């Protein structure tokens, strides 16, 4: 299966640059083009480049001729994607994309998960990760509710996964608040069955790329 | 360049719904992609009506030269997504601004949860109290946060979900945050919930320091 590995988050202070990897698998690297694509609320969907690892040949759209540089390492199978000079207006989410051939046409038939990368001058800040235990204030016929307090981080995104990802039923991850110091906060809960409560192991596993911080909390009664 | 409509279109299941897309020049194909909110886009139908693999047969794509669309036959809840267009026929490639689906079901009241500060974050000096509603319907949903029955005001924020592909719900969170010193100043901590589930407000509150 094709696929295509892509680092979290990027925190990049203005005036700076930033070097983003793309590790393509299930498939013969250099035999086929890859692709950049720009996601903001405002622009929408927008495509950067592409590059053959084949030779290492580069086409750009017009826009970012200046701010991306797409290389191509062809023993590694990673391409890479190097933005210059950043600014607000780079605040996105990158993808790397694979295209397909049918009809005479192309599409993109396999992205990568994406790197968001935030522009700001301000520091990172690793949350800290505070459990929301089950009660009995915390129960409803028959089911428990239960989570986790990422609290206090910067910037965006926070990731969580709930027993490593083997529990995704009930999971409500919510987006994340935005506090007055510029700082986020963010929750994640799970409603699970109040009888096994005494069996099963409840961790969330809490994710903050730009602050290197990987934590697993256990939320128990 | 590509336009679709409607931005947002509103959807029961299984109605049969249709959304277009509009392109400046004459275009070969136009490709669709479906995206949900977290998450990269999914191909969905490929060279104008051509189906991605695992996509129902529910879904299809229609349309030439410079109008296409994308139609479902009887939509269904996992349906809730941005849908957008894609053009490959000139450089460089653009899309669409995307058609939002929303899925429209009946009434459900909020389940709701409340949580104290856990004891590690008390030790920091801070307290966050946290209320929970659960799998509600419609969006709209009012949180009042009272302290020793006090209404409070500027000491909370609160997010809520995206709908959700299995029931069509949406869940929310308020987060009530105190410092120690003030948390530990009273004792009756409740989050008041108004929604249309609910003939009269729903209260879930604990008293600090009482297990």
């Known amino acids: 299966q094709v696929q295509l590995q892509q680092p979290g988050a990027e925190l990049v202070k203005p005036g700076a640059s930033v070097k983003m990897s793309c ?18 609320p405002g622009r929408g969907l927008e495509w950067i480049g592409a590059i053959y690892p084949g030779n290492g040949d580069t086409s750009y759209n017009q826009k ?6 797409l290389t191509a390492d062809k023993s590694s199978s990673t391409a890479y994607m190097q933005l210059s000079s950043l600014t607000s207006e780079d605040s996105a989410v990158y993808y790397c994309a694979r295209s397909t051939y049918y009809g005479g046409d192309w599409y993109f038939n396999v992205w990568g998960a994406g790197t968001t990368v935030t522009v700001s001058a301000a ?13 009995s204030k915390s129960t409803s016929g028959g089911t428990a509710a239960l989570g986790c307090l990422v ?14 990802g083997a529990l995704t039923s009930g999971v409500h991850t919510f987006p994340a608040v935005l506090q007055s110091s510029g700082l986020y906060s963010l929750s994640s809960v799970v409603t699970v069955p109040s009888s096994s409560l005494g069996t099963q192991t409840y961790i969330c596993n809490v994710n903050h790329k730009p602050s290197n911080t990987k934590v697993d909390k256990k939320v128990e009664p | 360049v590509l336009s679709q409509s409607p931005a947002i279109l509103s959807a029961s299941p299984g109605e049969k719904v249709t959304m277009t897309c509009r392109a400046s020049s004459s275009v070969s194909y136009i490709h669709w992609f479906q995206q949900k909110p977290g998450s990269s886009p999914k191909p969905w139908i490929y060279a104008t009506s051509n189906l991605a693999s695992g996509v129902p047969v529910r879904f299809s794509g229609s349309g030439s030269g410079t109008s296409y669309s994308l139609t479902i036959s009887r939509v269904e809840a996992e349906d809730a997504a941005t849908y957008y267009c894609q053009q490959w026929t000139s450089n460089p490639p653009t ?24 004891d590690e974050q008390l030790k920091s000096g801070t307290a966050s109290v946290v209320c929970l ?7 709209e949903a009012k949180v009042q946060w009272k302290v020793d029955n006090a209404l409070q005001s500027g000491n909370s924020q609160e997010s ?24 530990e100043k009273h004792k009756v901590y409740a989050c008041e919930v108004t929604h249309q589930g609910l003939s009269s407000p729903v209260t879930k509150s604990f008293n600090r320091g009482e297990c």
């Open chain 2, 133 to 139: 509603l659960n799998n509600f319907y419609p969006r």
């Open chain 1, 64 to 69: 970012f001729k200046g701010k991306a540089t």
């Open chain 1, 151 to 164: 609290k206090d981080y910067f910037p965006e995104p926070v990731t969580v996964s709930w027993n490593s």
């Open chain 1, 23 to 40: 590790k393509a698998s299930g498939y013969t690297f250099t035999s086929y083009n890859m692709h950049w694509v720009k996601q903001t």
């Open chain 1, 123 to 135: 520091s990172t800040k690793g949350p800290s990760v505070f459990p929301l235990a089950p009660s």
């Open chain 2, 95 to 118: 899309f669409g601004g995307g058609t939002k689906l929303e899925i429209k079901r009946t009434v459900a009241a909020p389940s709701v949860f409340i949580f104290p500060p856990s």
């Open chain 2, 160 to 183: 809520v979900t995206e709908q959700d592909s299995k029931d069509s719900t949406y869940s929310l969170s308020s987060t009530l945050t105190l410092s120690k010193a003030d948390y």
